[PDB]
Amino acid sequence: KLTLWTTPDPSPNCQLLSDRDAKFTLCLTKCGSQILGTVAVAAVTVGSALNPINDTVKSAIVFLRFDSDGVLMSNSSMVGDYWNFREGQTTQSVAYTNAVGFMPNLGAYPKTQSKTPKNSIVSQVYLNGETTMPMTLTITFNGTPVSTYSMTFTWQWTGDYKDKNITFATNSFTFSYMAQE
Amino acid sequence: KLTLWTTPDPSPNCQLLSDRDAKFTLCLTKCGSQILGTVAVAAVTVGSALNPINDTVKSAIVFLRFDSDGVLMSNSSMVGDYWNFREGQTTQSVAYTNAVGFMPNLGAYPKTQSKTPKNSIVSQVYLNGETTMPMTLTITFNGTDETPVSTYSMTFTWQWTGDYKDKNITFATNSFTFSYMAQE
Amino acid sequence: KLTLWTTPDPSPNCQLLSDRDAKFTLCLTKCGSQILGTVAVAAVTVGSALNPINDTVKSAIVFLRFDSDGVLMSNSSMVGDYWNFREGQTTQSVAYTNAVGFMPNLGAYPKTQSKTPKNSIVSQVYLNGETTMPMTLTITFNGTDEKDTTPVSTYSMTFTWQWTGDYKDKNITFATNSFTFSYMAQE
Ligand SMILES: [Ca+2]
């Protein structure tokens, strides 16, 4: 259908540092030629370098790699079990076979070895919504086996938070991009 | 309809510090699973610590509380007179009975949890569009821990640290774009 | 939901300082009462003051002027040949005659001589996606034209990038990250 999502309230479904150590929420809503996205992430397994932040790790990356049918590939940060077209508050029960309608346009965002600013959205965001804890979010489109499409979410910060008992978690963030078809 | 708004050019319709001391513009456009929003606010007419800014008050808050039908509740910052589905440049003449399609998803943004970071959007914006006057906007979904109790809520909090009393600046914002997952 | 765009991968189609010195990408998607936009720009002609940046110019402005039918007018930064409704990866072959559905609402964003913050979206962005090169983007709806221009625009959309950094000792091409925004449509 016109929504491809994690469900609105996913179980731990993402690796930042180790298996299913995070809840990654992503809703892609197809508005014809453009996808409207909202994304959030939270570390949930206690004792990782990001839960609480101990300052040994100052980035968190979620890599989504997609084959030529827009199907999530195994070498992605996120598990594909509940990455699917919407049905009510959950996902359709059968894995989708084609989501090229949700893939980032390869004309707008080409696969290249050159750093191309147009491939990315780069914004200042705030760790746990705290304006004293600035962070950068880079969303990059199409940045073995080789992926045909990709969507990468990179959070980076320079602050030291060790012994503030801060869990890595983000505010919801809105973005858009041109769809492949 | 698929648009729930204040009209594009509202009359003073909002309390920041006192009754109808502000024009709050909000357009919610239903794109299936997601609402696309654009918001702006200006202190107007009524003299106050925000008109002009005298540096005693360095936040402005608009609280929208909704019942289980997504109907605006009386204990909101904004008056409901011209909060309705679109008709041309104005609102339909009959008060809406259901806008649950526009309410923030209680799964995505669970209730009372203003402190769960996923419930909010937090962004750097600019007081009066002046890039020397940085400000934060926090949009919080379903944050409120209140009678009568709201089922859904949307809170807009502007905050800044600068001192502007000498500049005779009235509190006003740029238009700001956001989105959130809809309840249905 | 209808799309008015530059195509996703435009040829040089834009003046920042001189004719076709830039690639301006703009995709406007009509979501009923609101338009959803994504914009990017890159200077492409080598030897311009923005390619590489020589610090004589620390703003880049794209002015789009539209008549009462929402048709792009001659004195715009962008060429209109491939500004049109989407067909596949390109534009429909016939020039559109009406896009008022895509124009910024004159009630929300009036034409006035008074500076009105609500007419604009202002955000911090980063030159070439580099966080050490902070930049502002101002998107203004229905800003006033040059006083000596005729015919006058009914609608307008201005994109202003500004920065304070000096980059002449580097070899920086002016180019932006993709940027998402929305606005209330006229109809
Ligand atoms: Ca002139």
Numbering used by the authors:
A (entry chain B): 186 to 328, 335 to 372
B (entry chain C): 186 to 331, 335 to 372
C (entry chain A): 186 to 372
What do the study authors state?
We have determined the structure of the ChAdOx1 viral vector and used it in state-of-the-art computational simulations to demonstrate an electrostatic interaction mechanism with PF4, which was confirmed experimentally by surface plasmon resonance. Here, we characterized the capsid structure of ChAdOx1 and the primary receptor binding fiber knob protein. We have characterized its primary cell attachment protein, the fiber knob, and show that ChAdOx1, a simian adenovirus, shares considerable structural homology with human adenoviruses.
Adenovirus fiber knob is responsible for the primary virus-cell interaction during infection. To investigate primary ChAdOx1 receptors, we solved the structure of the ChAdOx1 fiber knob receptor. There is much lower homology between ChAdOx1 and HAdV-B35 fiber knob. The core fold is similar, but the loops are divergent. ChAdOx1 and HAdV-C5 were both predicted to form numerous polar contacts with CAR, with HAdV-B35 forming very few. HAdV-C5 remains the strongest known CAR-binding adenovirus with an equilibrium binding constant (KD) of 0.06 nM, with ChAdOx1 binding at 7.16 nM, not as strong as HAdV-C5 due to a slower on rate (Ka). To validate these predicted CAR interactions, we performed SPR of ChAdOx1, HAdV-C5, and HAdV-B35 fiber knob proteins binding CAR or CD46. This confirmed that HAdV-C5 and ChAdOx1 fiber knobs bind strongly to CAR but not CD46. A similar analysis in CHO-BC1 cells, expressing CD46-BC1 isoform but no other known primary adenovirus receptors, determined that HAdV-B35, had a strong CD46 interaction, while HAdV-C5and ChAdOx1 fiber knobs did not have a measurable ability to prevent anti-CD46 antibody binding. These experiments, summarized in Fig. 3D, are robust evidence that ChAdOx1 uses CAR as a primary receptor, not CD46 or DSG2.
